[PDB]
Design a protein around this ligand. Structure first.
Ligand SMILES: *[C@@H]1O[C@H](CO)[C@@H](O)[C@H](O)[C@H]1NC(C)=O
Ligand SMILES: *[C@@H]1O[C@H](CO)[C@@H](O)[C@H](O)[C@H]1NC(C)=O
Ligand SMILES: *[C@@H]1O[C@H](CO)[C@@H](O)[C@H](O)[C@H]1NC(C)=O
Ligand SMILES: *[C@@H]1O[C@H](CO)[C@@H](O)[C@H](O)[C@H]1NC(C)=O
Ligand SMILES: *[C@@H]1O[C@H](CO)[C@@H](O)[C@H](O)[C@H]1NC(C)=O
Ligand SMILES: *[C@@H]1O[C@H](CO)[C@@H](O)[C@H](O)[C@H]1NC(C)=O
Ligand SMILES: *[C@@H]1O[C@H](CO)[C@@H](O)[C@H](O)[C@H]1NC(C)=O
Lengths: 44, 198, 172, 84, 50, 38
């Protein structure tokens, strides 16, 4: 599973049988626990 | 639920945004809804044809969302034009239009801010506690027809007075608040009564 | 009713939900528009059995006991002149033709009995001659003009209504 | 009814204000009852050619009207949305 | 072939829905005008010209 | 998060409230005169 983003320490608690974690919009949020937060972007 | 219009507008906008967000992750006939997986898994020709399919689907979804947003923006612009007209007429002055600035005879209006709109507090006048009276179009006195300047001729059981339309303020029939126009032979329903001359 | 359509549409997305929501919103909007347009009052006023309006004739626009779906002759002509699967259905309107016609009858009774007083609150009975005198005063014409030409104005109104019904009968 | 068929609500011969609009003059309200909505209070005004009704009192009524003025301004980057 | 037919029919449905929405907006504007006319001319006397 | 941004309104809530307060004060203290001039 490839992607671009920022790895962050996660305060959420996973389960032994859970590897990935997706929030709303069915997009990758956490990967085994490390949270994926895309780097800052916007308009100019 | 006293601000149902603003809440409904916010809910519709949120629902459209959520629908677009959900549609962002649709297969659209492709092998996967994740572009990165396709690029990291599939050869450039098949990867780009899958990209074309995904682009077509997402562009159609975005076009639909933009069309709905434009229609909603037109509706909101019409509502804002109506609100501005009410602000100019009901708040900055007194409006004679019926039910434009609240039910009943409009007196004034007060503006209040809302998160995505405006609130008009319309202060109006409502008649109440009504009573029956006997009327006559004019008064035949001295062979002359007398009509009220402003108000109406009424009588409780035997005495005739002149009052105003919107409130019961009986006044003695007098030459100052009545005007003479012709004789009392052509008026239908005219009655005989005395007219006080001061 | 083909399973392949469902199989190929579940992966396509949820455009069907979008279209259903849009159609439901459109139907609700039309129902609200009808509700706002026709239900201007919350009381169903009725014309008194005796009709003495100073010579003005309103039997042309008032309902008749012949039961033509509780509509006036002009309303009957309007209804008669207008001439009117595969997943397409027509939702009946919330307000039926009889209900709208009875709203119209109540509005007519209020207008011809209480003038404009019922629109600002409780209906206030007043002779139609005095209401017409008030309306003449509104446009800057004194009451004596009405009172010395009441018969002529009533005849003119009746003639105008006659030309209106003649135009609605033959002229398309 | 001409709008279809309803199951689970008891039809009544009374008429109340519409609560859940079913359609074709039929409404539902809370067991669940289904009826024909009433247009409003039915009253007869005592009209006469020599009678008027004049108020003797007044009421100062304050009503609230809500009017949307604007909505949230949303910007969508097509390149980022479609492609990422 | 079925997918092509699905795309065509969905595009037709989108066009129909957009046309219906535009017509509904026009009818809503007309109904607002009619309600204003009923309020200001049937429930009262209007001083506005024409 | 996917190219979707919410642009803040030009007029803040405080400024809209100040407009409403100014209009209300002008209505009470001047009637309809302030809407047609000084
Ligand atoms: C007085 O007017 C009311 C209508 O407002 C009517 O119901 C009542 O019968 C009238 N009184 C008499 C004695 O006729
Ligand atoms: C009508 O009013 C006059 C003046 O107030 C009074 O003299 C008379 O007795 C009243 N008649 C009735 C029937 O109330
Ligand atoms: C009112 O109508 C009656 C008939 O019911 C008539 O006797 C009376 O003279 C009329 N009065 C006026 C003022 O027109
Ligand atoms: C009013 O008085 C005149 C003469 O004084 C009389 O001819 C006329 O009939 C009277 N009106 C009524 C309605 O009795
Ligand atoms: C009103 O007109 C109809 C049809 O011309 C007629 O039958 C009726 O008698 C008229 N009413 C009056 C009060 O003249
Ligand atoms: C039907 O309606 C009539 C008139 O409203 C009423 O008298 C009767 O009791 C009703 N019957 C039932 C079973 O609801
Ligand atoms: C009008 O109503 C108020 C209360 O709503 C009452 O205090 C007042 O006395 C009434 N006016 C008259 C003339 O009775």
């Amino acid at each position: 599973l490839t992607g671009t983003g920022v790895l962050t320490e996660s305060n959420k608690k996973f389960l032994p049988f859970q590897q990935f974690g997706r929030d709303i919009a069915d997009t990758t949020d956490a990967v085994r626990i490390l949270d994926i937060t895309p780097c800052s972007f916007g308009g100019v | 639920s006293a601000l149902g219009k603003l809440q409904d507008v916010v809910n519709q906008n949120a629902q459209a945004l959520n629908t677009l967000v959900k549609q962002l992750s649709s297969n659209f006939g492709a092998i996967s809804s994740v572009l990165n997986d396709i690029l990291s898994r599939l050869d450039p020709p098949e990867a780009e044809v899958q990209i074309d399919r995904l682009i077509t689907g997402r562009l159609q979804s975005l076009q639909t969302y933009v069309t709905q947003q434009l229609i909603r923006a037109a509706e909101i612009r019409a509502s804002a034009n109506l609100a501005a007209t009410k602000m100019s007429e009901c708040v900055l002055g007194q409006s004679k239009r019926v039910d434009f600035c609240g039910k009943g005879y409009h007196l004034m209006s007060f503006p209040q801010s809302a998160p995505h709109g405006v609130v008009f507090l319309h202060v109006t006048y409502v008649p109440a506690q009504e009573k029956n009276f006997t009327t006559a179009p004019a008064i035949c006195h001295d062979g002359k027809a007398h009509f009220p300047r402003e108000g109406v001729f009424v009588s409780n059981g035997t005495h005739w007075f002149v009052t105003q339309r919107n409130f019961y303020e009986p006044q003695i029939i007098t030459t100052d608040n009545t005007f003479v126009s012709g004789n009392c032979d052509v008026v239908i329903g005219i009655v005989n009564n005395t007219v006080y001359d001061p | 009713d083909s399973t392949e359509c469902s199989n190929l549409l579940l992966q396509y997305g949820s455009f069907c939900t979008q279209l259903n929501r849009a159609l439901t919103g459109i139907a609700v909007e039309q129902d609200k528009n009808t509700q706002e347009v026709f239900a201007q009052v919350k009381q169903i006023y009725k014309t008194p059995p005796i009709k003495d309006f100073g010579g003005f004739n309103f039997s042309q626009i008032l309902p008749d006991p012949s039961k033509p779906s509780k509509r006036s002759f002009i309303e009957d002509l309007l209804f008669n002149k207008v001439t009117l699967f595969n997943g397409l259905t027509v939702l009946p309107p919330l307000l039926t033709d009889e209900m709208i016609a009875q709203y119209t009858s109540a509005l007519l009774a209020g207008t011809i009995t209480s003038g404009w007083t019922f629109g600002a609150g409780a209906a206030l009975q007043i002779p139609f001659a005095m209401q017409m005198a008030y309306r003449f005063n509104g446009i800057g014409v004194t009451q004596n003009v009405l009172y010395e030409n009441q018969k002529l104005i009533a005849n003119q109104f009746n003639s105008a209504i006659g030309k209106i019904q003649d135009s609605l009968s033959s002229t398309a | 009814t001409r709008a279809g068929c309803l199951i689970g609500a008891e039809h009544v011969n009374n008429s109340y204000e519409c609560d859940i609009p079913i359609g074709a003059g039929i409404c539902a309200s809370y067991s669940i009852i289904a009826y024909t909505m009433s247009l409003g209070a039915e009253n007869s005004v005592a009209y006469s050619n020599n009678s008027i009704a004049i108020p003797t009192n007044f009421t100062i009524s304050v009503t609230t009207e809500i009017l949307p003025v604007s909505m949230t301004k949303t910007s969508v980057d097509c390149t980022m949305y479609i492609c990422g």
